[PDB]
């Protein structure tokens, strides 16, 4: 929601290679930046299932 | 943040009164909006301490009178704490020297109290 006015009309819009949450009324952002995994590390990491991570 | 000496030099209430008056006049001559809004506790503590000192008999004092009182009391072998308390309290009565003053035993001698009164009244 909006920290100042309290408007809950926050919309996700794709910026110039940037993801953020912004309200359409006052144009104020509440959360900017997103952390995503890299394919360089994705091929290195091994997947674990709950059928094996529980015994 | 470090402290060098917590008891470097003891001072009476007259120096504190003078410092409070100087800070008050400096603030009223150089008043700032944002500087005040940053910490309003400064004006509060200064005004309240100044009012507390004004309620005391600390008025009508000067550094020359304080120096004369110190030189007069230095001849009665009294310690710094007792003369400091006498200057801060300014006892116009003998009972405050005979009873309220600590370590009255062997120090009254029934004759120096009159001299102490004559010095504190001046």
């Amino acid at each position: 929601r909006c920290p100042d006015c309290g408007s809950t009309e926050l919309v996700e819009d794709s910026h110039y290679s940037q993801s953020q949450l912004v309200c359409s009324d006052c144009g104020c952002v509440v959360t900017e930046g997103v952390l995503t995994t890299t394919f360089s590390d994705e091929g290195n990491l091994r997947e674990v299932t709950y059928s094996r991570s529980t015994g | 943040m470090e402290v060098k000496d917590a008891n470097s030099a003891l001072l009476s209430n007259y120096e504190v009164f003078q410092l409070l008056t100087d800070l008050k006049e400096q603030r009223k001559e150089s008043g700032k909006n944002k500087h005040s809004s940053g910490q309003q506790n400064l004006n509060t503590i200064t005004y309240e301490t100044l009012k507390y000192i004004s309620k005391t008999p600390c008025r009508h004092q000067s550094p020359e009178i304080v120096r004369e009182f110190l030189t007069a009391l230095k001849s009665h072998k009294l310690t710094k704490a007792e003369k400091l308390q006498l200057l801060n309290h300014r006892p116009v009565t003998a009972v405050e020297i005979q009873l309220m003053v600590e370590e009255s035993e062997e120090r009254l001698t029934e004759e120096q109290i009159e001299a102490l009164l004559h010095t504190v009244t001046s």
């Binding site: - | 001072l11 007259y14 550094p63 304080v66 110190l70």
Partner: protein, 39 residues
């Protein structure tokens, strides 16, 4: 060393970081001290 300056994220000693700058502020070193009355 410059390597650890780059790693630790501090300005390196070489280059512009060798010397230091001082602001020419209007002041008075060792200002007059308020005299002590009781002491």
């Amino acid at each position: 060393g410059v390597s650890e300056c780059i790693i630790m994220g501090i300005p390196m000693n070489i280059g512009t970081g060798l010397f230091k700058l001082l602001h020419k502020a209007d002041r008075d070193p060792n200002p007059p001290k308020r005299p002590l009355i009781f002491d």
